[PDB]
Design a protein around this ligand. Sequence first.
Ligand SMILES: CCC(=O)N[C@H](C(=O)N[C@@H](Cc1ccc(O)cc1)[C@H](O)CN[C@H]1Cc2ccc(cc2)OCCCNC(=O)[C@H]([C@@H](C)CC)NC1=O)C(C)C
Lengths: 99, 99
Amino acid sequence: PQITLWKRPLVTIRIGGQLKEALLDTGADDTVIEEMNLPGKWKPKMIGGIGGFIKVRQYDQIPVEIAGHKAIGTVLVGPTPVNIIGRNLLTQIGATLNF
Amino acid sequence: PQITLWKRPLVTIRIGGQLKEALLDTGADDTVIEEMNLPGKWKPKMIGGIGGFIKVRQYDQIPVEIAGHKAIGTVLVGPTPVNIIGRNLLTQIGATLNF
Ligand SMILES: CCC(=O)N[C@H](C(=O)N[C@@H](Cc1ccc(O)cc1)[C@H](O)CN[C@H]1Cc2ccc(cc2)OCCCNC(=O)[C@H]([C@@H](C)CC)NC1=O)C(C)C
């Protein structure tokens, strides 16, 4: 899909067998998902953004379906205002910026 | 051009007669430039991201050239670790996400 940026690039994703809305964020190194139960072990981690640093749970090798496209990587779960798909998963689905 | 997301999508922009490196951010509603003495009237405002909110100065109709592409719009100036080109300006240069 070719997505324009007139509106926030929000798409539906499936993670942990559940559907969620997520922002395709090219300015994000990592993928940060709102607090939820994800099967598997997790390690505590700190990531920074605008405003500062927050504490997140780091889940590795998690399968995530982005608009029907598969990706398996690291997902950080924490207190985020919106579900964010970062470059770590965007590169897996072959996402590019064009202009 | 086509920009892959293997590394952060950093490009050269021209603002206030200066050349800066900025991040193409589809997850940003606004454009945020690192602290600089831009002339003109401004309006105080608060923008939020991952770790919280930061106070910034809102400058309207600021000319900003992005990778040789001309644009003009609202620019926020404040304590940011990196220059962020948001959707407000990305749409003007015809930028899209493709996968
Ligand atoms: C440092 C590693 C890194 O890349 N961190 C990421 C990050 O915050 N990236 C921001 C840019 C940045 C890069 C390197 C660095 O060292 C510090 C900051 C990027 O700007 C985040 N993109 C969005 C995400 C978001 C979207 C909506 C939100 C909150 C967050 O609430 C809606 C409210 C509206 N907020 C926004 O539109 C902001 C603008 C203002 C940021 C400039 N957007 C972002 O922060 C997080 C998301 C893993």
